[PDB]
Design a protein around this ligand. Structure first.
Ligand SMILES: CN(CCNC(=O)CNc1ccccc1)c1ncnc2[nH]ccc12
Length: 257
C-alpha cells in the first residue's frame, strides 16, 4: 500500500526516548535519509482505526507539520515513520536556558505552529492535543506540529490546562478548542516552558477557567503579543479568532517588532 513502508528499508541507529505511546528511534531509510521510527506500545492504541486514519494522514503535508512518511503494520509493534527533528521536543528546548532566546525567535516559534494549524484548519482537521509537548524542533530551529489527531486512537492524564471551558464542562471539541490550546502554547513559548497554571492542580485549573479567570502576561510577551494569545481565550468559542486571523496578527506584530 502507498501508506506502507517496508521495515527492511530501515537501519536503526539511536534511541531517542521511551514514553506512554512507546519507544522512538532515530534511523535511516534506504541507507541515506534520516527518519524517526515511532514504535507503538502494544495494547496502547486502537490499531485498526489508527491504520485506516494513516491513509488520510498521508495526504497532509506542510512545511510546519511533522511529515508522515508511512507506517509498518505487517508486524508488531507497528511503526510510524516520520520526519526526524534533531532538537527534540519544543517543551524541553524552551526550558534549556542556554539558548538565551530573543523574543523575535519566540514569535517565530509561534508563527511556525500557527502556519501548521492554519493548514490543518483549511483541511477541517483538529489537532485535539496541541501543546508544546506535541511540537518538535529541527536542526535549523524550525518548530513543527507533531502527533496531530493521534489522541483519537489512544486507549487510555487529560490536557486540562490546554482546554477551553466548553471542553471541560461539556466535551465540546471544535476548531475553537484548538484555538484555545494554541493560545496556551503561545503562553508556554513566551514563558520559556513553564507549566500553565503552575501553582494549581488540574482540578483547581478547571475551576479557575470556569470562573472566567485566565493566564496572564508572560514577562517576555509585549502588549501586542499578549493581545494575540489572550484573544484565544474568549469564554464564547465563536468570539475566538481563526488560525488565519491569528497568523495575520502574528505577521503584523513581527513587522512592528
Ligand atoms: C524525541 N522525539 C519525539 C518522541 N515522542 C513522540 O514521538 C511521541 N509520540 C509517539 C511515540 C511513540 C509511538 C507513537 C507516537 C523525536 N525526536 C526527533 N525526531 C522526531 N520525529 C518524531 C518524533 C521525534
Amino acid at each position: 500500500g502507498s501508506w506502507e513502508i517496508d521495515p527492511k528499508d530501515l537501519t536503526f541507529l539511536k534511541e531517542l526516548g521511551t514514553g506512554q505511546f512507546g519507544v522512538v528511534k532515530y534511523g535511516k531509510w534506504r541507507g541515506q535519509y534520516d527518519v524517526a521510527i515511532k514504535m507503538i506500545k502494544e495494547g496502547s492504541m486502537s490499531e485498526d482505526e489508527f491504520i485506516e486514519e494513516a491513509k488520510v494522514m498521508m495526504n497532509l503535508s506542510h512545511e510546519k507539520l511533522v511529515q508522515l512518511y508511512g507506517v509498518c503494520t505487517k508486524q508488531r509493534p507497528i511503526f510510524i515513520i516520520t520526519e526526524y527533528m534533531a532538537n527534540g521536543c519544543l517543551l524541553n528546548y524552551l526550558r534549556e536556558m542556554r539558548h538565551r532566546f530573543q523574543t523575535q525567535q519566540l514569535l517565530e516559534m509561534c508563527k511556525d505552529v500557527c502556519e501548521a494549524m492554519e493548514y490543518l484548519e483549511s483541511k477541517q482537521f483538529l489537532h485535539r492535543d496541541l501543546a508544546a509537548r506535541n511540537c518538535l524542533v529541527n536542526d535549523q530551529g524550525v518548530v513543527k506540529v507533531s502527533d496531530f489527531g493521534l489522541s483519537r486512537y489512544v486507549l487510555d492524564k487529560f490536557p486540562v490546562r490546554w482546554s477551553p471551558p466548553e471542553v471541560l464542562m461539556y466535551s465540546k471539541f471544535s476548531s475553537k478548542s484548538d484555538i484555545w490550546a494554541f493560545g496556551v502554547l503561545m503562553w508556554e513559548i513566551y514563558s520559556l516552558g513553564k507549566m500553565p497554571y503552575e501553582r494549581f492542580t488540574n482540578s483547581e485549573t478547571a475551576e479557575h477557567i470556569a470562573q472566567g479567570l485566565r493566564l496572564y502576561r508572560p514577562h517576555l510577551a509585549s502588549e501586542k503579543v499578549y493581545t494575540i494569545m489572550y484573544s484565544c481565550w474568549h469564554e464564547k468559542a465563536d468570539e475566538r479568532p481563526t488560525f488565519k486571523i491569528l497568523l495575520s496578527n502574528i505577521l503584523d506584530v513581527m513587522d512592528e517588532e
